[PDB]
Assembly symmetry: C7
Homo-oligomer: 55 residues x 7
Amino acid sequence: PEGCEQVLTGKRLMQCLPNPEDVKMALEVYKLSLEIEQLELQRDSARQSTLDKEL
Amino acid sequence: PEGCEQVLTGKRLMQCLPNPEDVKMALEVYKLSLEIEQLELQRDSARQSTLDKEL
Amino acid sequence: GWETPEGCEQVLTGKRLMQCLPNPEDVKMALEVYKLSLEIEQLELQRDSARQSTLD
Amino acid sequence: ETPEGCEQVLTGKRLMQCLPNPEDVKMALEVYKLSLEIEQLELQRDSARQSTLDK
Amino acid sequence: PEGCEQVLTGKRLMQCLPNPEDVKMALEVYKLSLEIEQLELQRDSARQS
Amino acid sequence: ETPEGCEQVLTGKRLMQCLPNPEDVKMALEVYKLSLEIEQLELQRDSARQSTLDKEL
Amino acid sequence: PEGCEQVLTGKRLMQCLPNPEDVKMALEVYKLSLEIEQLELQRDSARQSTLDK
Ligand SMILES: [Cl-]
Ligand SMILES: [Cl-]
């Protein structure tokens, strides 16, 4: 049908792996990894504030 | 009733596939893929700046 | 002997929405799906308007 | 007893009594919240298809 | 150990009620209530504005 | 036998040892996080019931 | 597809530990810890506002 193009695209992605359920987890994990890296950067780039701002 | 238009729209989307439960997953997967891509861009466009910063 | 206590208007509203369908659990999914669809569309726009912007 | 620092918890607990089944309370709220968020998204969508017509 | 301070704090909160699982729900519900109120304000302040 | 790129994972794993049952660790954090988020929300709410007041009175 | 590269990357991460399900939890926990720290800072840097006036 029409309107379902988004769904089909997602469905196609679910075939990147044998268990489509594994696809979602893989992405969730990768996404976590990326978000964490940004968080680590913010944390460091703020301690680099306080450390210098102890100065 | 009336006020249920949003619900109906969602319900219609759930018919893009035989198993409506698959529809939600398909969308979640696609959404993950998009979000990840943006995260990758931000990551690259930041590693591209730490570099510039020291030249 | 039930009387709904005070400060529950939000709850009632949600409850009313749960009657848009025979099965209330189906209501939440329907909305979640629609919401996903909308968010995705926005994401697609941002993606296109970024492959385009800077393109010239 | 009930320790101090649990005021937030008690408030939530009180809300869970708006209905016979407390698990229904959380769902009711989640649904209403979804409805509100969707409405906002619909507005943004329209007010963007309109930027793209009105000029 | 150390670094576990956050965990301990959360653990302490889980003792606000006999069933710790009820604590998380209570908070989730309260949070929902607050978020909704904000959403309602934004909605009204847009139908107005 | 851990590869490289797994540093984030190891860190999380170490946190999971703050308590005997590891599943309890995640809940404890989720609860604490909720508490903090809520406090911020309450502040925003108060600082808006206050601000509109300053603007409109 | 530029689709499967993302998946592969995630899949590789799932091998940081013997049980891949543990990987996701470890990350979720770490992420929580980071978010909480930020929240604590915001809270303090706002109570430090409700001091000066
Ligand atoms: Cl409230
Ligand atoms: Cl993609």
